[PDB]
């Protein structure tokens, strides 16, 4: 059987990559950061409580101005908040209430959303009439929309439960490039700072680094034991962190092509739903199923703080571009700003 | 300058919450339902009798609004997207009475899911007329696929329909007890299963959901007062 030889040759290549990564593992991240001083006890406080959502909140995204933010709740509403004054700027009724992700364009002129409808809907916020209307409905995915991120006003990358990711041309509404490497539901994606690459996390316990313009899977990262639910790039773009149902957070390096650190504790037995780094990348914030958010030391793997304000599962979190505050969404229909 | 901009934001905020108040009474008044089942379980026939990733079906019973959703273009991996239906009033699980063992395993996963622990399940044991034809024939026996059926006896609490063979009654109630054994194992008084012997062309399926939903809302209010 030629397939059995292809099964045999695959094991040879996986054994070659494993030994190639072992040769580069001279010293671990803990040994390098063994002499640096710890960050200490991080005690953030809830400064704002955003109230108005009628159902569980699934996703949120900060604007580039670090003031406005959009939130997606399964009641069929997209709300744009002014985090400074807690005032609602826009309330967008959705055609499908089963939204699972939302995005804020870097220019602040558009917002995106999607979910079980398998459609990524683009909404125009800067219409001269003064209302917010859908400008484009991106269809073509055969699974639920799990995450979406704007590259610019005309390009957006999406992840879907059909095990594929896609690059969309908003003007034409057609898929420019399709990424078909994963074997399970792709749950989240994270764009590089220069938007040349992006990483995705799927339900195959593996993460993949993609080339946006080339459309190829450059590196595949393994080490997790369960489905990866969240992913976030390091501020420098040379590393990223993942959150999975195995109650562990892991840090992977692109140039090293292997895992550097694992963030877990024996008292944590619930899966991670969202991950994000601080501005400097020293702190790794992660949302958990146990209604709590844990602040990890990205260099020493030490838990530095706990954000316990929500009454239900924390589904999403995000740090502002200026690093001033951290937002947290949860299934209790509330958003909380932490400083 | 600074006074005109902030005041324009406050008037825009109070206009939004004014609309959100109208959306709240509409959202809280309708009861959302999730329809689940195999491709040949008969759920599609119940929808028409009352591409896209999810279908919507809105019916009204005694001026009470219901919003039943049907899963469309989604893959067979359900462990992720099924978490979105944790706040629905009930999950309508349609089973074609070894496809039966596969439905029993799916029911066990839904019943024991961490996020679905507080969601009741309306069990529609569909295709009761097709089950009777197979039991009366005697060619396809159940005990070869369920050895405990040979030693199974019809419960005296059963309500057989007038003019029905006892072999059909013992067969359909054995399948019901297979689902009830899973529900009564981890019920914990948080959620309950409502089994029903239904057909695809039954007009009573709407009334069964309305009566079961009324019982679910009643048990929720009784739990908030810690009466049950």
């Amino acid at each position: 059987s030629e397939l059995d030889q292809l099964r045999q040759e695959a094991e040879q290549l996986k054994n070659q990559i494993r030994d190639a990564r072992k040769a580069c593992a001279d010293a671990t991240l803990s040994q390098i950061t063994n002499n640096i001083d710890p960050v200490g006890r991080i005690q953030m406080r809830t400064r704002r409580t955003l109230r108005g959502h009628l159902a569980k909140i699934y996703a949120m995204h900060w604007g580039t101005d670090s003031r406005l933010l959009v939130s997606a709740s399964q009641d069929g509403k997209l709300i744009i908040w002014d985090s400074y004054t807690t005032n609602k700027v826009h309330a967008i009724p959705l055609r499908s209430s089963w939204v699972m992700t939302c995005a804020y364009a870097p220019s602040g002129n558009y917002v995106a959303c999607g979910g079980l409808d398998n459609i990524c809907s683009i909404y125009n916020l800067k219409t001269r009439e003064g209302n917010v209307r859908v400008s484009r409905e991106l269809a073509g995915h055969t699974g639920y929309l799990s995450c979406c991120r704007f590259l610019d006003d005309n390009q957006i990358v999406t992840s879907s439960g059909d095990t594929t990711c896609a690059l969309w041309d908003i003007e034409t509404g057609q898929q420019t490039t399709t990424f078909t490497g994963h074997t399970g539901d792709v749950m989240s994606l994270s764009l590089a700072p220069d938007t040349r690459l992006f990483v995705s996390g799927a339900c195959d316990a593996s993460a993949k680094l993609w080339d946006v313009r080339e459309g190829m899977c450059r590196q595949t990262f393994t080490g997790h034991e369960s489905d990866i639910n969240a992913i976030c790039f390091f501020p420098n773009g040379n590393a990223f962190a993942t959150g999975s149902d195995d109650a562990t957070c892991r840090l992977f390096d692109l140039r090293a092509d292997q895992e550097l650190m694992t963030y877990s504790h024996d008292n944590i037995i619930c899966g991670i739903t969202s991950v994000s780094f601080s501005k400097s990348g020293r702190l790794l914030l992660a949302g958990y199923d146990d209604f709590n958010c844990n602040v990890w030391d990205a260099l020493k793997a030490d838990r530095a703080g706990v954000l316990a304000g929500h009454d239900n599962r924390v589904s999403c979190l995000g740090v502002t571009d200026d690093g001033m505050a951290v937002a947290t969404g949860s299934w209790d229909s509330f958003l909380k700003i932490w400083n | 300058d600074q006074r005109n901009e902030e005041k324009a934001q406050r008037e825009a905020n109070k206009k939004i919450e004014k609309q959100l108040q109208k959306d709240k009474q509409v959202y809280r008044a309708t009861h959302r339902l999730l329809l689940l089942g195999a491709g040949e379980s008969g759920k599609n026939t119940i929808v028409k009798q009352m591409t896209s990733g999810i279908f919507e079906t809105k019916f009204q019973v005694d001026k009470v609004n219901f919003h039943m959703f049907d899963v469309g273009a989604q893959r067979d991996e359900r462990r992720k997207w099924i978490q979105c239906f944790n706040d629905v009033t009930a999950i309508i699980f349609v089973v074609a009475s070894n496809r039966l063992q596969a439905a029993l395993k799916l029911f066990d996963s839904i019943w024991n899911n961490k996020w679905l622990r507080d969601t009741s399940v309306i069990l529609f044991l569909n295709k009761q007329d097709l089950l009777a034809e197979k039991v009366l024939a005697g060619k396809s026996k159940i005990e070869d696929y369920f050895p405990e059926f040979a030693r199974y006896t019809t419960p005296e609490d059963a309500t057989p329909e007038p003019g029905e063979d006892p072999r059909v009654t013992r067969a359909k109630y054995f399948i019901r007890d297979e689902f009830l054994r899973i529900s009564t194992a981890s019920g914990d008084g948080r959620h309950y299963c409502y089994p029903h012997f239904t057909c695809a062309v039954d007009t009573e399926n709407i009334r069964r959901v309305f009566n079961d939903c009324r019982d679910i809302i009643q048990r929720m209010h009784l739990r908030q007062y810690e009466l049950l």
Partner: nanobody
Amino acid sequence: QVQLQESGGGLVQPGGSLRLSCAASGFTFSNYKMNWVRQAPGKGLEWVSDISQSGASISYTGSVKGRFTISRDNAKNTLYLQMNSLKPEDTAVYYCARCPAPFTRDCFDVTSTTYAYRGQGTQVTVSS
């Protein structure tokens, strides 16, 4: 890297006996519930049996109850399936399927056509 490799099995006489083994690696074997699934020629994937994390909770499908025996060795990270009184109906490719999430009583999607936490399977043929 989650890896599941099935071993044992093959051609056997009707009424014979076989012992399947699944070597698990890349995850904490003691924290996951294990399953056995099979796919007959021209048929879909079918759940056969499962075993809890510790091994107290054990269930089988109706067709193999009394003939098949499932067990696990947490120290060796190995899943076992003792098949006795094999019939020609048992001819199928047998896969060892792990539940997707640890410390969970539910086990979703283990019979889906494309499941990540499932081995490549081993061929078991029962014929005279």
